């Protein structure tokens, strides 16, 4: 396939190539909670944080008094607001952390629950985050080890729970969506064994369903397996392409990895069969293979 103009993107520990007109929405998660990129300028961020602290200070726990516990200084201008996680909570706090990349300033919000008896540990994690958050240009590929997010990367190669999910649409293929995810930890079962029952059920029930492909699909040293199905009903064609690397425990570069491409049911435009996502199964498989075969761990030093 002609990848003229395709763009190599960094997501987490990985790289992937997408067409230049791809519409991309990404999310990044640390220890299970989203690290959200904020548009805030520094004065705006300060006002945002002060505003929230003062809101919390007006709120009351049902028995323990003030909902606001403390503002924590994580060093490197990063701060956290610590509050009870609810008005009846006794074992968990909400820790709302704000952190900036260096040396180019960008602001992030990373909020999640923390155990009362794990407070010091949570603090050290945020301290470390503030030390490790390095800025990068939107398409800059870091040669240093680390987990890439919007406008930055978390430098280092020490294990942490980390995950991303990226969703992609294609102007030329209405109704199609591609998604790419990584998550630390081995998935509990493997893709082919997991879905085969349901797929066989689909094939048996619906004459319009077919399996296009089922088996191994390694991409470099990534031991991926795939299951690709398509079907027709109501004069439109649907697709579900599934690819997975099971993952290894406590591994940043061998996490669980999934890639998927779907075309779900869409509607007729004023009583006319919806516009086709693809010209043919061959075209869909081509796009699928081209994207998946571009997935690789970001080379680092």
């Amino acid at each position: 396939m002609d990848k003229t103009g395709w763009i190599t993107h960094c997501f987490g520990r990985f790289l992937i190539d997408l067409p230049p007109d791809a519409v991309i929405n990404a999310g990044y998660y640390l220890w299970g909670d989203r690290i959200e990129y904020l548009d805030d300028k520094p004065t705006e961020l300060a006002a945002r944080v002060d505003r929230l602290e003062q809101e919390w200070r007006t709120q009351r726990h049902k028995s323990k008094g003030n909902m606001f516990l403390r503002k924590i200084d994580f060093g490197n201008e990063s701060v956290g607001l610590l509050s009870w996680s609810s008005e009846v909570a006794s074992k968990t706090y909400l820790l709302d952390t704000y952190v900036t990349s260096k040396p180019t300033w960008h602001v992030y919000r990373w909020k999640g629950k923390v155990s009362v008896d794990r407070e010091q540990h949570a603090v050290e994690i945020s301290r470390a985050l503030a030390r490790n958050l390095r800025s990068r240009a939107p398409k800059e590929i870091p040669s240093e080890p680390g987990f890439c997010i919007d406008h930055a990367y978390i430098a280092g190669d020490s294990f942490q729970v980390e995950r991303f999910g990226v969703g992609v649409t294609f102007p030329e293929h209405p109704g199609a969506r591609f998604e790419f995810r990584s998550s630390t930890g081995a998935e509990l079962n493997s893709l082919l064994e997991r879905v085969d029952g349901f797929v066989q059920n689909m094939l048996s029930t619906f004459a319009g369903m077919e399996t296009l492909r089922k088996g191994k699909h390694p991409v470099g040293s990534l031991p991926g397996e795939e299951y690709l199905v398509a079907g027709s009903d109501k004069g439109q064609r649907g697709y579900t392409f599934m690819w997975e690397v099971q993952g290894k425990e406590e591994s940043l570069t061998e996490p669980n990895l999934t890639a998927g491409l779907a075309v779900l049911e869409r509607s007729n435009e004023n009583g006319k069969p919806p516009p086709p996502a693809f010209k043919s199964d061959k075209e869909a498989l081509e796009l699928w293979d081209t994207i998946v075969d571009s997935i690789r761990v970001r080379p680092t030093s």
């Binding site: 220890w31 299970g32 968990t92 629950k113 794990r118 999910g165 995810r181 509990l188 689909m202 049911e265």
Partner: protein
């Protein structure tokens, strides 16, 4: 005119499509069960959102704070008279199509066609006039619709809007989201379309029509906040005080017959539900079944066992399901020790920021608080409720472990179940097994609360009637009335039953009599 009167439909259990909030990909688009494998694209939807998602992925993707309503689902405009584009704007693509699109389209066409050319139109001129008792109405206060009332109602333009919501989050927060939907999407449409000034806007009212847990969302909205915007409320199959089915599902998985599921064994369901305030809020409250037990430990002869103090092992024993069952970590608890591993599968407990059990116990305390507030706050003063009360649908109403707990309860107890309802194994026999009720020897006070609609035991379905709501329709074998002789309907599909539809339209007409103009 125009005198618009919006009808806001609020869906129920797992009823709203969801996508990941950051990446926008689809993570929930029901039905996802083995039933009904009757539509090709439906099955693609289930494959993509559920079947190919591993257990860890499911736990990550069905996380309340990380999902949002997806309004891009399929829509069946049916005979509503709406274009797909219009129905899409109305949010009808937010919710399970088969379960909800038909009733939304029915109400739309019925309410758009009450009086024409000085005659009552179809259905309104006959079926609608039924004495409420014939339809299973049990409070005995409200009367039949009359010609006055329909003429009055015909002066308004009803439009059905679909308030899909993030069912994983607390229903407390979903109430806020529905408020925002009404105030920021629904009403501004009429402001612009009808050229309404701010006073006219302020004077507008809406009518809520809810399914299932959507009724708890509605009550949070009208009863825990000042929201006079709501003129009245129709509830269908509300688990007003919760449902013992949540215990079955968390300990055994959903049954194969279920259209919508969160797993096929304990670990799968528990991994999602035990982290979701919205899901856990379905758990029976302290007031459920008027405080009587619903979880029974029985011997081989079906007789309830005795505890250390010689008291029946029928829980709750002292009206506290939160401590007695939900946080209990013994073999009969909601999340026994054997199932702790499913609370947070992301890493070994050690490196985490929050302990899995810490989080879970705080969530239980949260639901207890929400349950308590809802109970005290009651129901909107113009509430018309209907529910399925049928003894041919056991609904896990009596949750029974039958067998000998002795080997499970000796010091250093280690025995594990099969995550599907039994401790019997290749290695051990005659042990506790979840079996279908009803209990062999029952409490006479429990007679009225037996059966249900498969998901909501009558215990909970009849709570609004017991709390004194204006109208309550008891549908199925445990109710009365000549128009109520069919077997009671099933929960998920309740709004596809003529009685549920009748009760909804009846409620709307009655509530409308209160509208100013």
């Amino acid at each position: 005119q125009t005198a618009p009167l919006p009808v806001i439909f609020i869906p129920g259990i797992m009823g709203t499509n969801l996508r990941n909030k950051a990446d926008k990909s689809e993570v929930w688009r029901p039905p996802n069960g083995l039933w009904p494998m009757d539509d090709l694209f439906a099955s693609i939807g289930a494959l993509w959102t559920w079947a190919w998602r591993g257990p860890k992925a499911r736990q990550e993707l069905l996380k309340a704070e990380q999902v949002e309503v997806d309004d891009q689902g399929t829509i069946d405009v049916g005979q509503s008279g709406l274009s797909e584009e219009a129905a899409r704007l109305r949010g009808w693509g937010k919710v399970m199509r088969s379960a909800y699109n038909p009733v939304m389209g029915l109400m739309e066409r019925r309410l758009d066609n009450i009086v024409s050319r000085r005659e009552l139109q179809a259905w309104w001129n006959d079926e609608a006039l039924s004495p409420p008792g014939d339809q299973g109405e049990e409070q005995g206060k409200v009367g039949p619709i009359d010609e006055e009332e329909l003429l009055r109602a015909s002066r308004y333009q009803f439009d059905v809007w679909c308030a899909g919501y993030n069912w994983l989050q607390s229903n407390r927060q979903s109430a806020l989201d529905v408020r925002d939907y009404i105030e920021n999407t629904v009403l501004p449409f009429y402001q612009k379309e009808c050229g309404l000034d701010p006073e006219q806007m302020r004077r507008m009212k809406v009518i809520l029509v809810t399914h299932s847990m959507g009724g708890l969302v509605a009550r949070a909205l009208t009863q825990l906040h000042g929201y006079e915007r709501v003129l009245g409320v129709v509830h269908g199959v509300q688990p007003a005080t919760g449902s013992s089915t949540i215990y079955h599902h968390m300990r055994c998985g959903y049954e194969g017959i279920a259209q919508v599921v969160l797993g096929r064994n304990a670990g799968e369901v528990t991994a999602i539900v035990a982290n979701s305030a919205g899901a856990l809020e379905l758990a029976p409250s302290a007031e459920y079944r008027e405080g009587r037990p619903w979880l029974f430990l029985c011997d081989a002869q079906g007789q309830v066992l005795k505890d250390i103090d010689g008291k029946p092992r029928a829980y709750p024993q002292n009206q506290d399901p939160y401590e007695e069952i939900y946080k209990n970590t013994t073999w009969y608890g909601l999340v026994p020790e054997q199932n702790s591993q499913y609370l947070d599968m992301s890493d070994k407990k050690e490196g985490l920021r929050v302990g899995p059990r810490d989080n879970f116990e705080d969530l239980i305390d949260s639901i207890a608080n929400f349950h308590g507030e809802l109970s005290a706050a009651g129901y909107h003063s113009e509430t018309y409720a209907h529910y399925g009360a049928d003894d041919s649908r056991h609904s896990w109403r009596d949750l029974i472990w039958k067998g000998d707990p002795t080997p499970l309860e000796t010091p250093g107890a280690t025995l594990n179940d099969d995550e599907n309802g039994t401790y019997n194994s290749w290695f051990r026999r005659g042990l506790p097994t979840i079996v279908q009720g009803p209990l062999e020897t029952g409490n006479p006070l429990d007679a009225s609360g037996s059966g249900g609609d498969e998901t909501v035991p009558t215990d909970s379905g009849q709570a609004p009637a017991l709390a004194g709501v204006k109208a309550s329709f008891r549908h199925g074998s445990k109710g009365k009335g000549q128009a109520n002789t069919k077997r009671g309907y099933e929960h998920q599909e309740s709004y596809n039953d003529a009685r549920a539809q009748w009760a909804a339209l009846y409620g709307v007409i009655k509530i409308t009599q209160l509208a100013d103009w």
